[PDB]
Amino acid sequence: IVGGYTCGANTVPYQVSLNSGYHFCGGSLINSQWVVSAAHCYKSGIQVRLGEDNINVVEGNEQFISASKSIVHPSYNSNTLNNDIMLIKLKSAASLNSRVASISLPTSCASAGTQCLISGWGNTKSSGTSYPDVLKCLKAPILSDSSCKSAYPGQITSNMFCAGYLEGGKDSCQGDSGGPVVCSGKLQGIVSWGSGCAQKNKPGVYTKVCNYVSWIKQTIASN
Numbered sequence: 001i002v003g004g005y006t007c008g009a010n011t012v013p014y015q016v017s018l019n020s021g022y023h024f025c026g027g028s029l030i031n032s033q034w035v036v037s038a039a040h041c042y043k044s045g046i047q048v049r050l051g052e053d054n055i056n057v058v059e060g061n062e063q064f065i066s067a068s069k070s071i072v073h074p075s076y077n078s079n080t081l082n083n084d085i086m087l088i089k090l091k092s093a094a095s096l097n098s099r100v101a102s103i104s105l106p107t108s109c110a111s112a113g114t115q116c117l118i119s120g121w122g123n124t125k126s127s128g129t130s131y132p133d134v135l136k137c138l139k140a141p142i143l144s145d146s147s148c149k150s151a152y153p154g155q156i157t158s159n160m161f162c163a164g165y166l167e168g169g170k171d172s173c174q175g176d177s178g179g180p181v182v183c184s185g186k187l188q189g190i191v192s193w194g195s196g197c198a199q200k201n202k203p204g205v206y207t208k209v210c211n212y213v214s215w216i217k218q219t220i221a222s223n
């Protein structure tokens with residue numbers, strides 16, 4: 001996350017770290033047994049880390065659970081990043097508490113100008129490399145589709161949205177792929193892509209979760 005702030009420990013209780021010997025992606029806890037992340041976060045041998053703040057130190061609130069199963073969206077196109085969503089089943093259920101909580105699925109899509117919360121651990125610099133060990137946060141509006149498609153001509157589909165600022169400076173990208181975008185208490189987004197990071201007239205691009213709720217509910221119930 002470039003141009004944000006430190007969330008505060010355990011203030012984003014649905015935030016997940018996906019670990020493969022190291023932190024590689026984010027995700028969101030949607031119930032005791034399931035996580036949603038991005039399809040480009042697919043790996044074998046994931047361990048899902050709940051109740052994290054500092055990913056390099058054991059602070060006491062963590063739950064470390066192996067993933068049993070990953071499901072990439074059938075129509076995921078890794079060239080276009082269209083349908084960039086993946087469901088991760090936990091080997092054992094998470095124990096929900098003050099620090100480890102589920103986030104609700106949307107009943108409807110969020111509108112442009114809606115303020116959202118984007119969290120994650122990743123790269124804080126737009127030029128160069130600096131990875132923070134703490135959970136960072138950004139508040140950013142959902143931009144209009146016009147403003148989104150203009151920035152990435154012929155790249156944006158119906159399953160995407162943009163959030164942040166047109167001027168640049170504040171963004172996520174490398175700043176946690178797979179990480180949540182939460183608006184009015186619902187999971188509206190997944191950190192997917194965005195050209196460079198926090199560049200002028202380059203907003204972030206998020207997987208539009210409200211398109212997927214029927215797929216998520218069906219998949220989780222059948223698996």
Ligand SMILES: [Ca+2]
Pocket residue numbers: 052053054055056057058059062
């Ligand atoms: Ca920790």
